Amino acid sequence: QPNMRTRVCTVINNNIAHEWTLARIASELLMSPSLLKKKLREEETSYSQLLTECRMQRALQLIVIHGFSIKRVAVSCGYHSVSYFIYVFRNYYGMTPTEYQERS
Numbered sequence: 344q345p346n347m348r349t350r351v352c353t354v355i356n357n358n359i360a361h362e363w364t365l366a367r368i369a370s371e372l373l374m375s376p377s378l379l380k381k382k383l384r385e386e387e388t389s390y391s392q393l394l395t396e397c398r399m400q401r402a403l404q405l406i407v408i409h410g411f412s413i414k415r416v417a418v419s420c421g422y423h424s425v426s427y428f429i430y431v432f433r434n435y436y437g438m439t440p441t442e443y444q445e446r447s
Contacts, residue, residue: 347382348393355397360421365390398422399435406444413440 345353354371355363368390369379383389398420405416417428432440 346386347379348386348388351379351383351390351393352397355394356401359397359401360419362421363390363394395431395435399432402428402432402440403443406440407447413444416440 350372351368354368355361361367365380366376369376372379374382379390383393401420402416405411405419406413411419413429414425417425420428422428422431429439432438432443436443
């Protein structure tokens, strides 16, 4: 009995870089987009929040590998824009990907 946010994170983590939208996650779950939006909202989240969170979680795993540039990490997490990826990582972790890469 996994709740709805868990099932969505499971879909997303199967292919993190994928262009996930509400409809595409919903089709995987055999649900209407409207129902999926509804169930996620009852748990105070959206597909896009869950997407981001999944992507930040994956970013931690890749940033530590030798010579994987910040640029490479972003692309592997599905970001087309390194500035934007940096912005969302800094919001999520309190520091830039570069800072994080230098502590580890």
